[PDB]
A = this chain, B = another copy of it.
Amino acid sequence: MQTVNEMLRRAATRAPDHCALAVPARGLRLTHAELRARVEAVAARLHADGLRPQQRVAVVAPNSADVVIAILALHRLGAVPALLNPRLKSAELAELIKRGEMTAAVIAVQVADAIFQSGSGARIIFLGDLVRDGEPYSYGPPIEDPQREPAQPAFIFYTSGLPKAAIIPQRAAESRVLFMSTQVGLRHGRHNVVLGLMPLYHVVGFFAVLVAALALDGTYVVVEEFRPVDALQLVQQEQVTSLFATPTHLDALAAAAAHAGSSLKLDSLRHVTFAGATMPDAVLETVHQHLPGEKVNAYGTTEAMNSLYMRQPKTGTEMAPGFFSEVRIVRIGGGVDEIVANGEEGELIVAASDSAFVGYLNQPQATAEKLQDGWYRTSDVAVWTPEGTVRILGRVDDMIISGGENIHPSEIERVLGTAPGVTEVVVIGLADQRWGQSVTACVVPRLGETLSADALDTFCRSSELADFKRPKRYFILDQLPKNALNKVLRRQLVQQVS
């Protein structure tokens, strides 16, 4: 295998004086050699404080040169980084670190108060005490490089109840990186300038963006806070070659690009990648119109990384498997061998091979639901298009079944979201009748505007929606319950209105 540490180590020998990390904000740059030296010193220092291989260390911080150093430091030492969204509640993080039987928690954030106070036996470490603006606090001699095994735990990332801790084995790193090469077209070389828009607590943010940038002997441009025009300036100033960004980021960037024109020079940008299954047609339309480079839509999971893709996508929902991947669509709640007839909907399952997680930390029931007989079960519904591509319909858990009929709220949400006066819409099935459940739309109006159940129904009737798909009821609301990091709490909304 080639571990993260090895990939970065090897890169450093090939390009020791090339720029690894650029923070144009802080006027900060570090070469590959310089980035190693800090990874080594922060490593030795943690090791001098008692930290040993295989011990789990929480990391809770916004993106920064300093957290990159700390994370690779931890990995280099041998410890297992558990990367947590800093947007979680104090209560939630404290609980996850408690449940994770974690040895320490590297933080930058009162959240510190909470950890102490949860009972958890985790030594609270402030990121600024380890490294500041790329400058580490050094003490102790250099340390061993511990032996790493292919199935051994390497990194922990959390899913989208509470988030589950997916364990990423050592042998997963390489294909978690190289799919950026086989699917997206990135190649080895110092031409590589990669914009760090994706957060580091997400597997794409970490493997596909940070580690890929360094392992191809390129440069990772750190972004602490996303501002659309600022980011487009970075593309121009840094000669950015690729960006991987969220649907929301791209909408921002496309419109700023449009309301710029050839004001900004974006020619260096050859790759614009995104997980755009949930991306509305209109945004995608603006992406092709107003941003340069080859566009690649990508489908993946925390659990198995990349499973599908499309170069130059027409819709955001249909994609095909790439290198490393093997995929099936099976009857919902059936065995991994129950393939569906072509054109019938089912669950997307992907082979659980090198890139796959080895289980959810301390949750073997969840694991046995998800890893069956060598497959990973996405919980996503899909259909095989006549063109031989996979169309993603929505989550199994959001699927409304009304009068014995599969209805996917995301479809309806895409239609309703275009209705004049609508700012947000979530479609849910109410425990009810006609039967099983009834299609219900919950809609927030634009600032100042009214909405009408009647007018929205009229709008739907003029749309493409098949009859049975149309909402039977409308609730107009000032707000949707969003404390799963935005993400709507579909379950909790149902409770609120029923």
Contacts and interface: CB of A to CB of B under 8 A. Distances in A.
A354 B174 CA distance: 12
A179 to B, nearest CB: 9
Contact of A14 (B217, B320, B353): B320
Interface string A146-190: 000010000000000000000000000001001001111101110
Contact of A182 (B178, B321, B354): B178
Given A13-B321, A183-B188, 8 more contacts: A1-B1, A14-B327, A178-B178, A181-B182, A182-B188, A183-B187, A184-B187, A189-B311
B185 A187 contact: yes
A241 to B, nearest CB: 13
Contacts of A10: 324-326, 351
Contacts of A354: 1-2
A322 interface: yes
Interface residues of A, number: 31
A2 B324 contact: yes
A323 interface: yes
A216 interface: yes
A150 B149 CA distance: 12
A209 interface: no
Interface in A1-15: 1-2, 10, 13-14
A215 interface: yes
B182 A216 contact: yes
Nearest to A321: B14
Contacts of A326: 10, 13-14
Contact of A187 (B175, B181, B217, B351): B181
Contacts of A1: 1, 354
Number of copies: 2
Contact of A323 (B188, B320, B351, B353): B188
Interface string A301-322: 0000000000100000000111
B185 A323 contact: no
Nearest to A354: B2
B2 A216 contact: no
A19 to B, nearest CB: 14
Contacts of A183: 187-188
Point out which of A178, A323, A354 has the most chain B C-beta atoms below 10 A from its C-beta: A323
A193 B175 CA distance: 24
A60 to B, nearest CB: 32
Contacts of A325: 10, 14
Contact of A188 (B14, B175, B216, B322): B322
Contacts of A322: 14, 188
Point out which of A187, A311, A354 has the most chain B C-beta atoms below 10 A from its C-beta: A187
A439 B322 CA distance: 55
A9 B206 CA distance: 29
Contacts of A14: 320-322, 325-327
23 contacts: A1-B354, A2-B324, A2-B353, A2-B354, A10-B324, A10-B325, A10-B326, A10-B351, A13-B321, A13-B326, A13-B327, A14-B321, A14-B325, A14-B326, A14-B327, A150-B150, A178-B181, A181-B187, A182-B187, A182-B188, A182-B216, A189-B311, A216-B323
Interface in A194-238: 215-217
A215 to B, nearest CB: 7
Point out which of A185, A188, A189 has the most chain B C-beta atoms below 10 A from its C-beta: A188
Nearest to A185: B187
Contacts of A323: 188, 215-217
Nearest to A215: B323
A188 B311 CA distance: 11
Nearest to A328: B13
Interface in A395-435: none
A321 to B, nearest CB: 5
| Shortest beta-carbon contacts, A-B, top 5 | A188-B323, A182-B188, A188-B322, A185-B187, A14-B321
Contacts of A353: 2
Nearest to A6: B353
A471 to B, nearest CB: 38
Contacts of A150: 150
Contacts of A189: 311
A283 to B, nearest CB: 25
